[PDB]
Design a binder for this molecule. Structure first.
Ligand SMILES: [Mg+2]
Ligand SMILES: [Mg+2]
Lengths: 304, 304
């Protein structure tokens, strides 16, 4: 219940991991950093599998699709992995629209995002527009507002989009003038972590901008939004009480666990540090303190 | 004292307006709506001048320089207007940087904004770069982050920029990696009002985007930011107790007045309606309740 931020070892470690029906893994900062993977991570999955434990993988990535993600696992030495275990914000975004755009014929979405995100939409029957560069044509507003749009658009989907422009912001706002139109954000992250400790602006910057202009609260898919779990529980029977959430980041992965009622395990490889976790415990922010923590997910094995 | 949202007529209209040493006007929705001016607005100004009252004009516009704004006034039938009375967010942005870069040699700023905003900076001694289109080329992040920047940049200034892109956002974040660098936002408005009641995304959307990515709280110039007043009091001696703030919007102009200690007057020829004012008074949110209100600023003449 109350995260004591205890290091998960020996007696407690065998208990909690042992009792777990399944384990939920963030990918970046947990299983790997770039193409260089965390020691013993592949073996951990093998043993989790043989222990009879369901392992699922969750990612706020919105740039590259399920197929190319499964391959990434293979490239990095993770084998025997089914695509059905992979859940990205783009996938779950598509899943949301399909449910919302139920009895709507020829469902269309304006997409400020990647070709992958489009693919995930196209896999659920939702056609896409907006992917790619949209440079600003015209002298002033009257020109920008006269650009012909898609009449069948029933949703604005903001994912990660390096081609995000004021022009796209305008189109999205225009589309959203129809109240019935949906606004979806793949994730609210302010930063996208990069391989060697670098970063660039995160999708949440683009989402928040559209929200402000359109004066709307977007539906967010990715962690720490509980819908990520919703997306999972539709496919898998996941008793959160018997499932561990493992992540490197406190503001995404851990908060996700608490909101879903999962026992959370912070790994000290990746973004967050223990000092920060205790600082939250230390600061009274009851929802960002991990129940347990480990130096690396490799430490989890003796629990099996 | 406590703004009761009273209708300003006869005795009350005679009292405070009579006692007022000066009057501060927002332009859009007060003096005019688009190119259509409020009947008798020019007359009010003529009569205020002869009454011996200093009139100043404040705007969150960042697309028009002081000169080009003065012309708008003259061409729209407002005569005897000195440019010294005009205060735009772009102008005050320049005033801020000049003060903050008080002793920096060859000061440079990265500007996500208009050529005008650049001019106000260039008139104040601050060199500018970033104005105009900045298309994103390169396959991924490593390419985007390897783009050579201008070394002398000591400030990021976010104004209204229809060329705003993820590349510009990226450049801004990189500049801001040096903590000593400044982050300035001309205004935080969610929307930019257009001639015929239309609108487009406001500067505040872009600013918030840069803030999130760079994890910075930008310094805001325009209303309702008190700095707009500071910018003015550097030029004019304004006793706020003897100065009227007149505006069409409650959340920008009126909030601005309360924060500066000016007697606030809502004109109903603009964005806000009387209904909204009564809602705030009813709700106890004192900083958005106008002390007084008039159907049009033309009603103020009988106070003289
Ligand atoms: Mg991660
Ligand atoms: Mg206005």
């Amino acid at each position: 219940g109350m995260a004591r931020c205890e290091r998960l070892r020996g007696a407690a470690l065998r208990d909690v991991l042992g009792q777990a029906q399944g384990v939920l893994f963030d990918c970046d900062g947990v299983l790997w950093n770039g193409e260089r993977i965390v020691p013993g991570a592949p073996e951990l999955l093998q043993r989790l599998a043989r222990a009879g434990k369901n392992t699922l993988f969750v990612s706020n990535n919105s740039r590259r699709a399920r197929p190319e993600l499964a391959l990434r696992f293979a490239r990095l030495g993770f084998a025997g992995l089914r695509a059905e275990q992979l859940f990205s914000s783009a996938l779950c975004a598509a899943r949301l629209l399909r449910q919302r755009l139920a009895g709507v014929p020829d469902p269309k979405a304006y997409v400020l995002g990647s070709p992958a995100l489009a693919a995930e939409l196209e896999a659920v029957g939702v056609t896409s527009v907006g992917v790619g560069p949209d440079v600003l044509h015209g002298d002033g507003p009257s020109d920008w507002l006269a650009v012909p749009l898609e009449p069948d658009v029933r949703a604005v989907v903001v994912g990660f989009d390096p081609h995000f422009s004021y022009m796209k912001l305008t189109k999205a706002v225009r589309y959203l003038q129809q109240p019935d139109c949906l606004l979806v954000g793949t994730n609210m992250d302010n930063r996208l972590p990069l391989e060697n400790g670098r970063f660039i602006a995160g999708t949440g910057c683009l989402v928040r901008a559209v929200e402000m202009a359109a004066q709307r609260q977007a539906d967010i898919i990715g962690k720490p939004s509980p819908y990520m779990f919703q997306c999972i529980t539709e496919d898998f029977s996941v008793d959160p009480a018997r499932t561990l959430m493992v992540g490197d980041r406190l503001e995404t992965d851990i908060l996700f666990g608490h909101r879903c009622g999962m026992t959370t395990v912070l790994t000290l490889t990746g973004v967050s540090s223990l000092e920060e976790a205790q600082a939250y415990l230390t600061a009274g922010q009851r929802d960002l303190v991990p129940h347990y923590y480990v130096e690396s997910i490799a430490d989890l094995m003796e629990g099996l």
